[PDB]
């Protein structure tokens, strides 16, 4: 049931993160952070300008395979 989410940063870097729709946004941030060398509390994710809350699943935000998210650093 693997999906690959595309995370887009403010320098135009695209980072692809393999995960599950059932993963929480918080757990997605944990994996992303280790992939890119940061920590979850140092970053924010948005989907279409709306901030993703840690306790809600990717799938509940309609985050699917190839969905784009926007990454911001605190």
């Amino acid at each position: 049931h693997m999906i690959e989410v595309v995370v887009n940063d403010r320098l135009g870097k695209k980072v692809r993160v393999k995960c599950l729709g059932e993963d929480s946004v918080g757990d997605f941030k944990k994996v992303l952070s280790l992939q890119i060398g940061t920590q979850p509390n140092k970053i924010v994710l948005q989907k279409g300008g709306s901030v993703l809350k840690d306790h809600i699943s990717l799938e509940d935000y309609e985050v699917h395979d190839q969905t784009n998210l926007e990454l911001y650093y605190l």
């Binding site: 049931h1 693997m2 692809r16 993160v17 393999k18 995960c19 599950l20 993963d23 757990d27 944990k30 994996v31 280790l34 992939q35």
Partner: peptide
């Protein structure tokens, strides 16, 4: 990142594998 290295990260975080 490969599925395998992703799963290494997931396992260390105490998450279910893909």
């Amino acid at each position: 990142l490969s599925i395998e290295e992703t799963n290494e990260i997931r396992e260390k975080l105490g998450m279910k594998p893909i």
